[PDB]
Amino acid sequence: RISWVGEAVKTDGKKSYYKKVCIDAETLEVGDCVSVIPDDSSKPLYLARVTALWEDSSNGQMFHAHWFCAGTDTVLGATSDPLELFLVDECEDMQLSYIHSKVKVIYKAPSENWAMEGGMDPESLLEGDDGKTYFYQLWYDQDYARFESPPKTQPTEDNKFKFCVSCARLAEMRQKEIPRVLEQLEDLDSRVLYYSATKNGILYRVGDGVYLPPEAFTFNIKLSSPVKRPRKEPVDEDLYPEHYRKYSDYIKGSNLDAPEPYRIGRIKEIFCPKKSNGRPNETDIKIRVNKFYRPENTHKSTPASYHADINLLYWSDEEAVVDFKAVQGRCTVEYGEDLPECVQVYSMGGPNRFYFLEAYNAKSKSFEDPPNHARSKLPKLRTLDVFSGCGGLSEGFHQAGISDTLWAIEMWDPAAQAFRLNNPGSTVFTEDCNILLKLVMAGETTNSRGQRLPQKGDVEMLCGGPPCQGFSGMNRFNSRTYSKFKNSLVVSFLSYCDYYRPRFFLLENVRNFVSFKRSMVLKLTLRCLVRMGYQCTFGVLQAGQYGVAQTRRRAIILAAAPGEKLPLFPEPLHVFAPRACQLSVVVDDKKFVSNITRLSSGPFRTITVRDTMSDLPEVRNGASALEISYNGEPQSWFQRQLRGAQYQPILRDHICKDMSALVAARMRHIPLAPGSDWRDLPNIEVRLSDGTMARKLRYTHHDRKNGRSSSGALRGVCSCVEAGKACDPAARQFNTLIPWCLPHTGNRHNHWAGLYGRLEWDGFFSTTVTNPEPMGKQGRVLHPEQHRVVSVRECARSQGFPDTYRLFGNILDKHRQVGNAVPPPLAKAIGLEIKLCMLAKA
DNA sequence: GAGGCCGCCTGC
DNA sequence: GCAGGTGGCCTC
Ligand SMILES: CCc1c(C#N)c(S[C@@H](C(N)=O)c2ccccc2)nc(N2CCC(N)CC2)c1C#N
Ligand SMILES: [Zn+2]
Ligand SMILES: [Zn+2]
């Protein structure tokens, strides 16, 4: 019933291989695809390509199965084409008895004309199926949710009869995962030194720079012990009655829990211990490095980093021995005086670049010169930016050097004007993108303004952030919400992608884009891209990890045309508060992460509010002067970068809103200490600038949950503080310095922590929003010391805008332009990944 | 036009 | 229970 076809081609040990076999009516050669029934008959069939056939002398006839992955098993889930399979690196040997049948599985290769085949309607993108036999077009990575073009690994001349792409690639992966040694330098008594070694695909030579975790070594400088603030001192509970609502010690925006950045070492010796016979123990690779001092690591503590470049190091003669496995990555560390180009052109010329000028001696606590033994393009993509705003994303991409935004669609006119101001020679459309795409599809050349419409082939990269009004909830889709989504700007954007078929595609959105409607918006977006034939993936980035003093998690969908390389997500550059760095995403109770490997540390120190705005001159509440004096040079590396090279005699848009007299009193009665907000307000009468009065907040009801003051006073300001009693309108009080509504509903809003909250110089911004309001959602918008709301220029700094980036409109328009924008440092990191792909194209 | 006011859901 | 994430709507 099961019989071989011929004699054996190769017999090794207990196995004997054959090329063709016969099962009960059928003949199978290596290369055919088959089906296998799981032990659970309710689960669907498994499908695999046979890669080898043989017989084991103690178990019987065997074959090697390289499994396919059903589309429902990918992140696409139920939205997958019911007949679409995906190549995966999964395989196993299995008895031929498990084979159920032979199935036809076709490879649907994109045509040479793929770029012109777009134009299918949203319904055909969302729900259209292929309508043929089993087919695959893409390889799938399950831990990163990456759909990519199938690998082109070639078969051996000695291992062709039994070759398996999956086995070959898994062996490649393991062999690059294990660290090895290379050209052997010199034999010593106790160890043997090498000139080079390799780890995770990176080549480390003697003299290269290594990233190490902060635990890898310590410095000879005594890390002088700071003092955590003693227990919260008791305050006058009748003067600051709401202070009791600060029983949590957690400070929003604080960097007290932010990790330390990497240690930087220079490889002095790569070496292995010798076995007693003299041969090296090459499974135990050690390295000897010279400790580099960051400025903040010298006897001058943290303040030494306020002015220094973020990549400035101090050479030292201290040394350390660590395990090679501890190396977190390679980096360049150059002596500045020997550098061919200037220090700025160097630092801006590539990743992981550090330089040193002086040398640090901890024993002497002095800076001297380092010993002598310490010495030794391509065309931009034409880009269409949909829902551009003032152009933060386009600016970041331009800074990466990959894009010229030739076309932008922005319906809000002041943001369109700002994008024009910053991007002359780009065509900015203010029409509905649906109207534009329909005009293009109808054969139109120009819009009603005379502007030339982008045609197929003009658009080489497509990026944008589409709003998600109507379906931004978590509840499941119904008919109404699904219709609103099918007629949505997200789907319109995908239609743009399908029509123009650019080389690269980026959808940016709020973090929760990945969870909307039980992750259905995400799943349908990926489904559309796959239906177009794109390679694609998704992930969540934290903008603060790329060089801004702000927590801003954004969702990122990346797509790359067939023939391209699918970009990686950018590795974090700066350490950041870990609680602001939850980037994982759960889809159908499966956890996906990105390719990011820097989880606990990083190469650059975190950017603080001090780095962001310590150089801006003091202004009053309601500052309106559009052009003022900086009153001095930039102070931090970040300020030098954003102010730029050419000297700027004018500081622009350092204006603030003119909050009312009551709000101004409140603000100037918020303490300057970190973590201060409305709960530290005093309960006093105060006369306002308009001569009116602000009265005490009187406590009129017993909150049995929160109790009473140390003086015995009540803590409720309304009858609703009782069990089921409703709001007595007479209990509402007006023109109180302590706003009445915050104690009124604070028990169910985490005591409205952060409202009327000050920023911290050592800390970061909460998410920069379109209109900073101290009693709104994100109400931590007060200046660290000045009695005002954060300014437009300060918000721009928190978003990482260059100071020369022109805005447009009134102050609320400009706040909104800044708030809506993608932080250019984040956009630039993504763009550099895209550039990697552009450079590494076959 | 600007300020007071403040639900519902999720991950832990 | 705590922290985070989403602005909009009466009202004068
Ligand atoms: C934290 C303060 C707050 C916010 C905020 N940020 C909202 S955003 C909500 C809406 N406003 O529609 C919305 C939902 C979906 C999309 C866009 C906006 N909503 C709040 N609620 C007050 C009573 C209102 N009827 C609605 C619920 C509160 C509070 N407190
Ligand atoms: Zn295999
Ligand atoms: Zn009430």
Selection from A351, A363, A199 nearest residue A287 by Cα: A199
Catalytic residues of A: 468
C-alpha torsion angle, residues A297, A300, A302, A304 (rounded to 10): -100
Rounded distance, CA A763 to CA A74, Å?
A: 40
Rounded distance, CA A258 to CA A256, Å?
A: 6
Tokens 């994109």 label which residue?
A110
Residue A101, Cα to own-chain centre: how many angstroms? 45
Rounded distance, CA A405 to CA A382, Å?
A: 6
Alpha-carbon separation of residue A742 from A192, A242, A245, A678, A736 (angstroms): 69, 10, 11, 9, 11
- Distance in angstroms, CA of A675 to C1' of B7? 26
Selection from A288, A169, A231, A840 nearest residue A566 by Cα: A840
Identify the DSSP state of A228: P
Tokens 């679409």 label which residue?
A84
A410 is in an annotated binding site: yes
What are the tokens at A411? 């319906």
The C-alpha R_g of chain A, in whole angstroms, comes to: 32
Rounded distance, CA A782 to CA A672, Å?
A: 10
SS (H, E, C) A515-547: CHHHHHHHHHHHHHHHHHCCEEEEEEEEHHHHC
Contact (Cβ atoms closer than 8 angstroms) between residue A822 and residue A388: no
- Distance in angstroms, CA of A420 to C1' of B8? 40
Rounded distance, CA A383 to CA A391, Å?
A: 12
- Distance in angstroms, CA of A796 to C1' of C2? 31
Tokens 């990456």 label which residue?
A146
- A748 Cα to the center of ligand 1, angstroms: 14
A441 touches strand B (CB under 7 A): no
Residues flanking ion ligand 2, Cβ below 5 Å: A 91, 164, 166-167
Identify the DSSP state of A583: -
Rounded distance, CA A267 to CA A174, Å?
A: 25
Helix (H, G, I), strand (E, B) or coil at A499: helix
- A741 Cα to the center of ligand 1, angstroms: 15
What are the tokens at A234? 């008791």
Q: How many C-beta neighbours within 10 Å does residue A696 have?
A: 15
Domain of A458, in residue numbers: 381-608+825-840
A776 touches strand C (CB under 7 A): yes
H-run or E-run covering A20: strand A20-23
Ligand 1 atom at shortest distance from the alpha carbon of A473:
15
A232 touches strand C (CB under 7 A): no
C-alpha torsion angle, residues A380, A386, A391, A392 (rounded to 10): -90
- Looking across all nucleic acid strands, the nucleotide with the smallest C1' to CA distance from residue A736 is B4
A741 touches strand C (CB under 7 A): no
**Helix, strand, coil abundance in chain A, percent, nearest 5:** 25, 25, 50
Contact (Cβ atoms closer than 8 angstroms) between residue A612 and residue A606: no
A661 touches strand B (CB under 7 A): no
Helix (H, G, I), strand (E, B) or coil at A232: coil
Contact (Cβ atoms closer than 8 angstroms) between residue A391 and residue A385: yes
> Distance from first CA to last CA of chain A, Å, rounded?
48
A558 is in an annotated binding site: no
Backbone angles phi, psi at A707, to 5 degrees: 85, -145
Alpha-carbon separation of residue A65 from A33, A58, A407, A580, A749 (angstroms): 9, 20, 49, 43, 56
Tokens 């890390």 label which residue?
A223
Ligand 1 atom at shortest distance from the alpha carbon of A469:
16
Residues flanking ion ligand 3, Cβ below 5 Å: A 718, 720, 727
Rounded distance, CA A115 to CA A499, Å?
A: 9
* Strand partners for A757: none
CB neighbour class for A104 (10 Å; exposed up to 12, middle 13-18, buried from 19): exposed
Q: How many C-beta neighbours within 10 Å does residue A563 have?
A: 14
A697 touches strand C (CB under 7 A): no
Backbone angles phi, psi at A36, to 5 degrees: -140, 135
Helix (H, G, I), strand (E, B) or coil at A751: helix
Residue A671, Cα to own-chain centre: how many angstroms? 34
| Protein CB footprint (7 Å) on chain B nucleotides | 2-12
Contact (Cβ atoms closer than 8 angstroms) between residue A412 and residue A514: no
* Residue A252 one-letter amino acid: K
CA angle centred on A677, ends A671 and A683, rounded to 5°? 75
Q: Within A80-148, where are the H helices?
A: 122-126
The residues, ordered by sequence, that sit 6+ positions from A647 with a Cβ below 8 Å of its Cβ are none
- Looking across all nucleic acid strands, the nucleotide with the smallest C1' to CA distance from residue A249 is C2
Helix (H, G, I), strand (E, B) or coil at A497: helix
* Residue A596 one-letter amino acid: I
A773 touches strand B (CB under 7 A): yes
Q: What is the secondary structure of A35-84 as a DSSP string?
A: EE--SSTTS--EEEEEEEEEEETTTEEEEEEEEEEEGGGSTTGGGS-TTE
Helix (H, G, I), strand (E, B) or coil at A397: helix
The residues, ordered by sequence, that sit 6+ positions from A47 with a Cβ below 8 Å of its Cβ are A33, A34, A35, A36, A67, A68, A70, A85, A103, A105, A134
The residues, ordered by sequence, that sit 6+ positions from A692 with a Cβ below 8 Å of its Cβ are A661, A735
What are the tokens at A462? 């497509």
Q: What is the secondary structure of A135-151 as a DSSP string?
A: EEEEEEETTTTEEEPPP
A438 touches strand B (CB under 7 A): no
- A558 Cα to the center of ligand 2, angstroms: 30
Which residue out of A252, A777, A781 has the highest number of ligand 1 atoms within 8 Å of its CB and is therefore the one to mutate?
A777
Identify the DSSP state of A815: H
Identify the DSSP state of A324: G
Selection from A444, A394, A440, A401 nearest residue A420 by Cα: A394
**Which stretches of A105-216 are assigned E, i.e. beta strand?**
105-107, 134-141, 146-148, 180-181, 184-187, 191-194, 196-199, 202-205, 209-212
| Protein CB footprint (7 Å) on chain C nucleotides | 2-8
Identify the DSSP state of A512: G
Q: Are strands A134-141 and A84-95 parallel, antiparallel or unpaired?
A: parallel
Q: Whose CA is nearest to atom 3 of ligand 1?
A: A777
- Looking across all nucleic acid strands, the nucleotide with the smallest C1' to CA distance from residue A474 is B9
Rounded distance, CA A322 to CA A288, Å?
A: 7
Tokens 């034999």 label which residue?
A187
C-alpha torsion angle, residues A737, A738, A739, A741 (rounded to 10): -150
Q: How many C-beta neighbours within 10 Å does residue A102 have?
A: 16
Backbone angles phi, psi at A366, to 5 degrees: -140, 160
Rounded distance, CA A678 to CA A699, Å?
A: 16
Rounded distance, CA A46 to CA A67, Å?
A: 7
What are the tokens at A566? 């699918």
The residues, ordered by sequence, that sit 6+ positions from A17 with a Cβ below 8 Å of its Cβ are A8, A9, A10, A11, A52, A53, A54, A161, A162
Rounded distance, CA A60 to CA A643, Å?
A: 74
Ligand index nearest the alpha carbon of residue A91: 2
Rounded distance, CA A269 to CA A291, Å?
A: 13
Helix (H, G, I), strand (E, B) or coil at A793: helix
Q: Within A442-515, where are the H helices?
A: 479-486, 489-500
Q: Whose CA is nearest to atom 30 of ligand 1?
A: A749
- Distance in angstroms, CA of A437 to C1' of B8? 37
Rounded distance, CA A675 to CA A673, Å?
A: 6
A319 is in an annotated binding site: no
A660 is in an annotated binding site: no
Rounded distance, CA A127 to CA A80, Å?
A: 9
Scanning residues 797 through 816 of protein chain A, those with a beta carbon under 7 Å from any atom of strand B turn out to be 812
H-run or E-run covering A3: strand A2-4
For A274, half-sphere exposure in the C-beta direction (CA atoms, 13 angstrom radius) is: 14
Which CA-bearing residue is nearest the C1' of B11?
Answer: A582
Selection from A380, A542, A397 nearest residue A463 by Cα: A397
Rounded distance, CA A315 to CA A362, Å?
A: 11
The residues, ordered by sequence, that sit 6+ positions from A274 with a Cβ below 8 Å of its Cβ are A190, A191, A192, A280, A281
Scanning residues 663 through 692 of protein chain A, those with a beta carbon under 7 Å from any atom of strand B turn out to be 663
- Looking across all nucleic acid strands, the nucleotide with the smallest C1' to CA distance from residue A467 is C6
* Residue A694 one-letter amino acid: A
> Per residue in A58-86, is it b (16+ CB within 10 Å) or e — as a string?
eeebbbbbbbbbbbebbbbbebbbebbbb
Q: Are strands A319-323 and A263-273 parallel, antiparallel or unpaired?
A: unpaired
Rounded distance, CA A559 to CA A504, Å?
A: 6
Domain with residue A431: its CATH number is 3.40.50.150
Q: How many C-beta neighbours within 10 Å does residue A710 have?
A: 11
Q: How many C-beta neighbours within 10 Å does residue A128 have?
A: 15
Identify the DSSP state of A469: T
Which CA-bearing residue is nearest the C1' of B9?
Answer: A474
Contact (Cβ atoms closer than 8 angstroms) between residue A468 and residue A390: no
Q: What is the resolution of this structure in A?
A: 2.7
* Strand partners for A557: A507, A538
Q: How many C-beta neighbours within 10 Å does residue A446 have?
A: 10
C-alpha torsion angle, residues A427, A429, A433, A438 (rounded to 10): -80
Q: How was this structure determined?
A: X-ray
A512 touches strand C (CB under 7 A): yes
Region at A527 (left for phi over 0; alpha for psi -120 to 50; beta for the rest) = alpha
Rounded distance, CA A446 to CA A715, Å?
A: 66
What are the tokens at A832? 């550099």
What are the tokens at A115? 């770029």
* Residue A387 one-letter amino acid: F
Tokens 């974090």 label which residue?
A572
- Distance in angstroms, CA of A740 to C1' of B4? 9
Scanning residues 536 through 595 of protein chain A, those with a beta carbon under 7 Å from any atom of strand C turn out to be 551, 553, 579
Contact (Cβ atoms closer than 8 angstroms) between residue A506 and residue A462: yes
A522 touches strand C (CB under 7 A): no
Q: What is the secondary structure of A242-291 as a DSSP string?
A: GGGGG-----TT--TTPPP--EEEEEEEEEEEBPTTS-B-TTS-EEEEEE
Which CA-bearing residue is nearest the C1' of B1?
Answer: A812
Which CA-bearing residue is nearest the C1' of B12?
Answer: A579
Contact (Cβ atoms closer than 8 angstroms) between residue A331 and residue A352: yes
Q: Whose CA is nearest to atom 4 of ligand 1?
A: A777
A526 is in an annotated binding site: no
Contact (Cβ atoms closer than 8 angstroms) between residue A194 and residue A288: no
Q: How many C-beta neighbours within 10 Å does residue A345 have?
A: 10
Ligand 1 atom at shortest distance from the alpha carbon of A776:
2
Ligand 1 environment, Cβ below 6 A: A 472, 777
Rounded distance, CA A423 to CA A288, Å?
A: 50
